[PDB]
Amino acid sequence: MPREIITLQLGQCGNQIGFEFWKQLCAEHGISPEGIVEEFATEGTDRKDVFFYQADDEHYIPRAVLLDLEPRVIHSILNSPYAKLYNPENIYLSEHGGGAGNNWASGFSQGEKIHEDIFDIIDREADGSDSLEGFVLCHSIAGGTGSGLGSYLLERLNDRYPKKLVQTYSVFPNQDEMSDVVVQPYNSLLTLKRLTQNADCVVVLDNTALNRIATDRLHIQNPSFSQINQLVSTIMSASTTTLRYPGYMNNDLIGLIASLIPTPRLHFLMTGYTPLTTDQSVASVRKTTVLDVMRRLLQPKNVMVSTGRDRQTNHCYIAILNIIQGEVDPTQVHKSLQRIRERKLANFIPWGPASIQVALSRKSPYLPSAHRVSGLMMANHTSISSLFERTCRQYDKLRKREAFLEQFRKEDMFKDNFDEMDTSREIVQQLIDEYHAATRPDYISWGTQEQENLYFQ
Amino acid sequence: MPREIITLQLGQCGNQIGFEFWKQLCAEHGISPEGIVEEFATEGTDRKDVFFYQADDEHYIPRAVLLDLEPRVIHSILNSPYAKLYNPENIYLSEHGGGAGNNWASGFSQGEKIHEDIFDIIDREADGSDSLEGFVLCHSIAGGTGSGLGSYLLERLNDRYPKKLVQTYSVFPNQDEMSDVVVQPYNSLLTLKRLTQNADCVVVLDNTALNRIATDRLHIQNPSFSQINQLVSTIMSASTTTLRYPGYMNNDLIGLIASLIPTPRLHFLMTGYTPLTTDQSVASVRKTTVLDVMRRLLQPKNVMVSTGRDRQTNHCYIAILNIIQGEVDPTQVHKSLQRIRERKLANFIPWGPASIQVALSRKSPYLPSAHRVSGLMMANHTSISSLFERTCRQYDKLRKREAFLEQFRKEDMFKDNFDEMDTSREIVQQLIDEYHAATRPDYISWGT
Amino acid sequence: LIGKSINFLHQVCDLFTDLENAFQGKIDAAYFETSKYLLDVLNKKYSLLDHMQAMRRYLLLGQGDFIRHLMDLLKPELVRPATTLYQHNLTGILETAVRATNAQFDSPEILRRLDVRLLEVSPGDTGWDVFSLDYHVDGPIATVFTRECMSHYLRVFNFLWRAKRMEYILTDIRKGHMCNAKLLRNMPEFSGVLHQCHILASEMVHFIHQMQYYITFEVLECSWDELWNKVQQAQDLDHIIAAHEVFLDTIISRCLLDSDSRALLNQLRAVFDQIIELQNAQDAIYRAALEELQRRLQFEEKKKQREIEGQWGVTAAEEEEENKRIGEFKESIPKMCSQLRILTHFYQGIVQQFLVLLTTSSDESLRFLSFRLDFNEHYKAREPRLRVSLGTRGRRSSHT
Amino acid sequence: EEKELVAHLRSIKRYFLMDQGDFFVHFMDLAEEELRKPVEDITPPRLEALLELALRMSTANTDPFKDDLKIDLMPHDLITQLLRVLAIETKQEKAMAHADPTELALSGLEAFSFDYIVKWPLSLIINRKALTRYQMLFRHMFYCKHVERQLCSVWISNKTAKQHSLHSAQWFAGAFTLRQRMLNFVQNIQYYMMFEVMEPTWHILEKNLKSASNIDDVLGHHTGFLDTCLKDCMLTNPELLKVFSKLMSVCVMFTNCMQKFTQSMKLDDTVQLVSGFEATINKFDKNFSAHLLDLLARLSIYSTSDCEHGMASVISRLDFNGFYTERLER
């Protein structure tokens, strides 16, 4: 049976991102915005069941649970063309419509309030799945609601499906734009915590890199947050294409994340894509050379992930899963990974066999690709912790200053203390230590408290 | 990979010259003003990566950095056809918009204030370049902003790509005309200083020489400031052609200037082009002969550097490379060499090996050539010292008079003293002396 | 050739001066026309192109969603002894996986030809050893899809299915380990055992999935597409038969299903067996770690609940038993990690030797399998042959 | 028409005559690290991939015949091969036969040539004798480009060295002047070979191929083209070729010395190291100048005794500024 993926939509921004992700998956699988297979979608070679569930023999319904503390986004989804894709019983909107006030703790309390609906949606999607692989949580790290609700959804998916894989698409906040959400670092820390502890694979999409690309290539002086979020959703889609487009290998979510996630604790993945082009720039058939492509991939302005400079950890690849979209020959993907190894773009564990898995899949005929050749790399690299460690440190810096905490004190999770923030910081620290351990032969013992205490001394 | 050139645009005049240079390079490479490859650029023999960088997989952006201390020029660049050519992260505009007040030191201080943006621009262009050779700074030496900011950009270009060669096309101010910019001689000195210290070869573009070329060769009675900037951009194109038009030899900027620059100090180059035509003068296709080409290139009236007619000193070229394209008769080449020798129209260096390298390439289908046969010369010529020596003498004359120093004292670099202007004048004097030595056999010991 | 084509259609679907040349051109033209008519009849009556497409979808693993779903459904069944497998049950599982995957969208004429075959069930056999896809060829299409061709296609199908089954078993082991890490966060001493299980399962999944990818795409899918293109471009029935036979032989060789690749096939089978062993060891380690984590969590929950009720959270006997259980779990975690490391190292050695043999194999698909198995150059660090094969031959043909 | 002789010939010009400078730039950028290894240490896969990158990277990707372009690693360096060939029936034949093949692992840079796949019936015209001449031209241009790239790298490295220590600038002036003599020399040799030999002989071939009456005329014109390019590139004179080889070897050794010194200065008895570097540069300058004067003297000799009027062009290019004229007279 196909490996179904349950989509968890958290908060206003997260729910919008999840809706656009489900729209993109439907477009790639030829599913209409109403959840009905189009009459023209006769090429039954796509794996819709990876990301969508069938409600009947003809109707594919997204395995999506919409949870928000503000009603505006949920109403916009129910007012969108994709209103019929989602189960209406799987859409939770807070009656008060007030949102989480950009408070991570408020978002967590809202997730707790919508816990029943979201977990009922996830369980309903899993029971309709013969071999449900797991849940995918879609959320924003910059708001208040989407981060806490996403962490709640990840926790409940881990609790309910302890033998199932949990992949996450974790959007990192843009670092070049001034976020109006001053408490964003707490939300980002909680989301990175939940991805580290309760997800099996988290593809980090740093909006900062999206903004940099918008600035340098589109000549946009001030890249908006919306363009960065759409780039992050595109990156997550590209990283999940091998799960959503079945092929010879890595045709299932557990198979997709197995090659990407070497250890259960070292589950913080970094992504890279090349060549990167903006949707608007299709106009200029650029004579990009192979040399220019490789140099641009190494150029931070063209890479869709802004990984921090971790100075403490000799970051290496723990595991790599390559999701290739388009016309791909398995031998060509293998040669490409080999060339990456020759350039030492990824260091692998020395104590066991590890590689970049390559799946060859046909492309969707319905989706126009702006790039003649594209590729996504998913890798677990300790340098992704530098983003998460920095988010955790900023969260702790805000909590120690009680900045924007008045919005969180309204929610029960933060009424008495800020213990949820400290637990998030500890989870991100354990993730950093495990990712550093995953660079070492001792990765067999990664995530053991003795290694966390040895990397924190 | 092509040898990419990063363009540094400084001040109003420098930014206009840089914009026109990038436009001309795009036309030669068949790049639209929007960064799209033109359908007419089917001759894939041009190095677009020399003048443009890829910003993404589809958009080619000119490697141009727009730096001004006054917001007018930066806004004009962002409102120009080249707005999409430059990386928006590579455009630095001073928030105060006040400019440098025609003060070289103020322009330098503004460059120091915009140092981060400029070096970020250089690094972004280098990372987008597979085999970045270096940065070329286009600016005017006569204003306040474009000269100082150009020197700042040159310093930051050397700092950011310190292992990469940096050639510059530095337009030096006319020293024989009274500049309305009283601090221009200081500005000219600062530009010659930066060319001497951070460039490996400096082609001096004298706006007086640009006007002379427009009058005698382009038949332009009154060359506009825009025409002077376009002449400077043409000079930069001619000096960078070996980087921008790959062939069997001189396929990189460091390789191109290596043959031209015998010593690091003897880096003051003079340029000449023939036939020189104004954009308006395209109508008359002059049947220029090889003899006429060589004579006009060697003629100061058509040369993009205004050297005085020294009758006492045998000023000479250190090296000259003429790339000639089109129908050339060997007998006409022979007659041209004969006439040049008889008229002594070109003196060559006596102290080292130098020749005219010839690479045969097809012409760009996208760039209209006004001449059935055309040729560019890039040369290191001691007569450029006459421009640099005059600029240095004028700088010293202004600094000793504290002329226009009040505008510089507003900027921190010149608040306490004008020592930067005097150091610039001394550097330009040493550059002039080294360039003059390069005409002599004793150039081996120049600067000792 | 004309009379042969006529017989195939029936059973399966100047003369005064230079007599020798007067009819030669006419004989050749008539031969061409008769052969073309025979090939068209064979195609129209036996659906040769449709049989080739069915072979591509099922036996060449072209319906990658179908193969994925079959392997996922078989994983809990194929780990069991084959002696308990029912061929009817395996076919029902295949049909269920089809209905649960994009295989349900295949045409009824194609889907009816894709089936699950169970080999003779022996004790100790896994499903990977007995599961195969088959494609029934008959009539005129059986002239192109001969019994040899069908056997080669079924061999490639079974090999890919076994490799995918082992990959999915190891992926399920690693998924369980990763998910239980969330549960075992409250039992950090047990987390390392789960991580070691995840690492071993990830290595085994990588090996098996790379072998399956090579077989199904580089060998099976490409040879099937070549067969279909040749049949569509076939000028005669004999040309179609020969082109399909050559395609099937190419698929067998590159999927290691031919007679000559038998050593490569044995090395790949040993790699798959070591990957399955690693998967099973990792799944057992992760199961033990998750059970220990669940016991620790239940003990902590009971303690907290008793404390909330104002009772002494744990009795001294109960507290000693809980501490003993946590101690035993922590002491088994290093042991579980060591066992998983040993299994991973054995699997990696077997995979490296298989990759070396594949890189030395004449089949290009095997070279692609070697390149995929050592994408991070882990096997290339362990198997010299994957590094040597690409470097040595190209320099020799460049010296002339 | 059917064998597209002119299209194949244009492909040969594009690849073997290094007409596609952007192609050669891209190829040498991708392959320089792999070709710098000993031929035994070179991975042929990397050269084929760099070739494919250069093919895809150049405007040759629009060439329908680009796939006929191959990388060929010659068993002998071009200079030893040409000297052995020219020594046939010469007094040097015995000296080349008794010349131990120097244990210098032949570098890919010295072994690199193109080959071109010509199918029947076009294999009648683009035969192995033609392909081998194209390979010789390719390897010659590639080696000239290697020497140019080394002189430019030494230039850049020296420009960087001039930026790190103001005081070392005086010591670097002599290395700069040596590099500049080598660079002007290398560029003028490349210019002669490209625009007066390869380009003229190709234009003559295309004109003669346009005037061919039969396939044997086309073959004759192609052979005459290859023989003209070979003659005018100084490849047929063993003494000139041997002096050019020594000159290029001295240029490469100078560039390697300058690169090592600039790298050392960047990473950084120092006065002793500087005096040793200057002494090495002066020894390279002396050797280069001696070989250049011997080259110009040989060109003048062949120009006067053998009526090789082309050799006067080499001399005029080599001494375009009269730098060697006083030295030639001396």
Residue A71 CA to residue A42 CA, distance in Å, equals 37
Structural contact between residues A104 and A421, judged by C-beta atoms closer than 8 angstroms:
yes
Which neighbouring-strand residues pair with C53?
none
**Residues preceding gaps in chain C (C to N > 2.5 Å):** 13
Binding-site residues of B sit at: 142-148
Structural contact between residues C162 and C125, judged by C-beta atoms closer than 8 angstroms:
no
Tally the residues of chain C: 400
Structural contact between residues B274 and B294, judged by C-beta atoms closer than 8 angstroms:
yes
Structural contact between residues D72 and C398, judged by C-beta atoms closer than 8 angstroms:
yes
CA B231 to chain centre: 10
SS3 of residue B253 by DSSP: helix
Q: If we measure between CA atoms, which residue out of C169, C325, C362, D318 comes closest to residue A131? A: C169
Which residue has tokens 């991973």? C344
**Neighbours of B (≥3 Cβ pairs closer than 8 A)?**
A, D
What six digits make up the tokens of C49? 């192109």
CB contact set of B28 (below 8 Å; sequence gap of 6+): B46, B51, B237, B244, B364, B366, B367
Q: Which amino acid is at B87?
A: N
**Residues preceding gaps in chain D (C to N > 2.5 Å):** 268
Exposure string of D10-39, with b = 16+ CB inside 10 Å and e = fewer, is bbbbbbbbbbbbbbbbbbbbbbeebbeeeb
Q: How many CB atoms lie within 10 A of CB D120?
A: 7
Structural contact between residues B191 and B175, judged by C-beta atoms closer than 8 angstroms:
no
Structural contact between residues B236 and B273, judged by C-beta atoms closer than 8 angstroms:
no
Q: What is the DSSP string of C156-181?
A: HHHHHHHHHHHHHHHHHHHHHHHHHH
The DSSP code for B4 is: -
* Crossing angle (nearest 10°) for helices A419-437 and A104-113: 100
CB contact set of D100 (below 8 Å; sequence gap of 6+): none
Give the E-state strand segments of chain D in sequence order: 69-73, 112-116
CB contact set of C342 (below 8 Å; sequence gap of 6+): none
Q: Is the peptide bond before A275 cis (omega within 30 degrees of 0)?
A: yes
Instruction: Annotate C26-42 with three-state secondary structure.
Output: HHHHHHHHHHHHHHHHH
What sign for the dihedral angle of Cα D317, D323, D326, D330?
A: negative
Residue A199 CA to residue A156 CA, distance in Å, equals 11
Residue C279 CA to residue C273 CA, distance in Å, equals 10
Please tell me the number of Cα atoms within 13 Å of C353 on its side-chain side: 16
Residue D163 CA to residue B196 CA, distance in Å, equals 11
Q: Which residues of D touch A (CB under 8 A)?
A: 26, 29-30, 46, 49, 52-54, 56-58
> Å from A296 to nearest chain B CA?
5
CB contact set of A17 (below 8 Å; sequence gap of 6+): A9, A138, A139, A140, A171, A229, A232, A233
* Crossing angle (nearest 10°) for helices D21-35 and A290-297: 60
The DSSP code for B37 is: B
CB contact set of A250 (below 8 Å; sequence gap of 6+): A242, A243, A256, A259, A321, A323, A357, A359, C209, C213
Structural contact between residues A98 and A70, judged by C-beta atoms closer than 8 angstroms:
yes
| Subunit contact A301:B129, Cβ cutoff 8 A | no
Residue B190 CA to residue B201 CA, distance in Å, equals 16
Q: Which amino acid is at A156?
A: R
CB pairs under 8 A between C and D: 30
CA A337 to chain centre: 23
Residue C191 CA to residue B7 CA, distance in Å, equals 55
CB contact set of D181 (below 8 Å; sequence gap of 6+): B352, B353, D285, D288, D289, D292, D323
SS3 of residue D71 by DSSP: strand
What six digits make up the tokens of A144? 């208040």
Q: If we measure between CA atoms, which residue out of B84, B2, B6 comes closest to residue B47? A: B2
The DSSP code for D196 is: I
CA angle A375, A377, A383 (to 5 degrees): 145
| Subunit contact A217:B83, Cβ cutoff 8 A | no
Determine how β-strand C131-134 pairs with β-strand D69-73: unpaired
Structural contact between residues C368 and C216, judged by C-beta atoms closer than 8 angstroms:
no
Tally the residues of chain B: 448
CA angle B10, B16, B20 (to 5 degrees): 120
Residues of A in contact with B90 (CB under 8 A): 216
What six digits make up the tokens of B233? 């951009």
Residue C165 CA to residue C335 CA, distance in Å, equals 27
Q: Alpha-carbon Rg of chain B, whole angstroms?
A: 20
Q: Is the peptide bond before B275 cis (omega within 30 degrees of 0)?
A: yes
Q: How many CB atoms lie within 10 A of CB B24?
A: 17
From the list D45, D47, D74, the residue facing C399 with the nearest CB is D74
Please tell me the number of Cα atoms within 13 Å of A255 on its side-chain side: 42
* Plot region of B111 (φ>0 → left; ψ -120 to 50 → alpha; else → beta): alpha
**In which element (H, E) is residue C115 found?**
strand C115-118
Q: Which amino acid is at C364?
A: E
**Neighbours of A (≥3 Cβ pairs closer than 8 A)?**
B, C, D
CA angle D30, D35, D37 (to 5 degrees): 130
Residue A412 CA to residue B197 CA, distance in Å, equals 66
Which residue has tokens 């001396």? D330
Structural contact between residues A73 and A46, judged by C-beta atoms closer than 8 angstroms:
no
* Crossing angle (nearest 10°) for helices A115-127 and A104-113: 60
The DSSP code for B182 is: T
What six digits make up the tokens of B386? 């006459």
Instruction: Annotate chain A with three-state secondary structure.
Output: CCCCEEEEEEHHHHHHHHHHHHHHHHHHHCECCCCEECCCCCCCCCCHHHCEEECCCCEEEECEEEEECCHHHHHHHHCCHHHHCCCHHHEEECCCCCCCCCCHHHHHHHHHHCHHHHHHHHHHHHHCCCCCCEEEEEEECCCCHHHHHHHHHHHHHHHHCCCCCCEEEEEECCCCCCCCCCCHHHHHHHHHHHHHHCCCEEEEEEHHHHHHHHHHHCCCCCCCHHHHHHHHHHHHHHHHHHHHCCCCCCCCHHHHHHCCCCCCCCCEEEEEEECCCCHHHHHCCCCCCHHHHHHHHCCCCCCCCCCCCCCCCCCCEEEEEEECCCCCCHHHHHHHHHHHHHCCCCCCCCCCCCCEEECCCCCCCCCCCCCCCCEEEEEEEHHHHHHHHHHHHHHHHHHHCCCCHHHHCCCHHHCCCCHHHHHHHHHHHHHHHHHHHCCCHHHHHCCCHHHHHHHCC
Q: If we measure between CA atoms, which residue out of C50, D258, D239, A69 comes closest to residue B254? A: D258
Please tell me the number of Cα atoms within 13 Å of A100 on its side-chain side: 43
Q: Which of A296, A302, A304 to substitute to test the interface with B, most B CBs within 10 Å?
A: A296
Q: What is the DSSP string of C196-231?
A: HHHHHHHHHHHHHHHHHHIIIIIIIIHHHHHHHHHH
Residue B174 CA to residue B191 CA, distance in Å, equals 12
> Å from D190 to nearest chain B CA?
6
Q: How many CB atoms lie within 10 A of CB A182?
A: 14
The DSSP code for D107 is: B
Q: If we measure between CA atoms, which residue out of B257, B360, B259 comes closest to residue D193? A: B360
CA D321 to chain centre: 23
Q: If we measure between CA atoms, which residue out of B125, B401, B377, B102 comes closest to residue B256? A: B377
CB contact set of D263 (below 8 Å; sequence gap of 6+): D157
Residue D6 burial (10 A CB sphere; 0-12, 13-18, 19+): middle
Instruction: Annotate C78-110 with three-state secondary structure.
Output: HCCCHHHCCHHHHHHHHHHHHHHCHHHHCCHHH
| Subunit contact D322:B252, Cβ cutoff 8 A | no
Q: If we measure between CA atoms, which residue out of A272, A258, A158 comes closest to residue A204? A: A272
Q: How many CB atoms lie within 10 A of CB D281?
A: 23
Q: Which amino acid is at D127?
A: N
Residue B198 CA to residue B213 CA, distance in Å, equals 28
Residues of D in contact with A289 (CB under 8 A): 26, 53, 56-58
Q: Which amino acid is at B142?
A: A
- Chain D contact present for B247, CB below 8 A: yes
CB contact set of A400 (below 8 Å; sequence gap of 6+): none
Structural contact between residues D159 and B254, judged by C-beta atoms closer than 8 angstroms:
yes
Instruction: Annotate D227-248 with three-state secondary structure.
Output: HHHHHHCCCCCHHHHHHHHHHH
Q: How many angstroms separate the Cα of C191 from the Cα of each of B370, C184, C305, C337?
A: 76, 6, 25, 10
What six digits make up the tokens of A24? 């993109």
Structural contact between residues C303 and C193, judged by C-beta atoms closer than 8 angstroms:
no
What six digits make up the tokens of C355? 């990759």
Residue A172 CA to residue A195 CA, distance in Å, equals 12
Residue D149 CA to residue B165 CA, distance in Å, equals 13
Technique used: cryo-EM
Q: How many angstroms separate the Cα of A353 from the Cα of each of A389, A433, B274, D50?
A: 29, 21, 66, 29
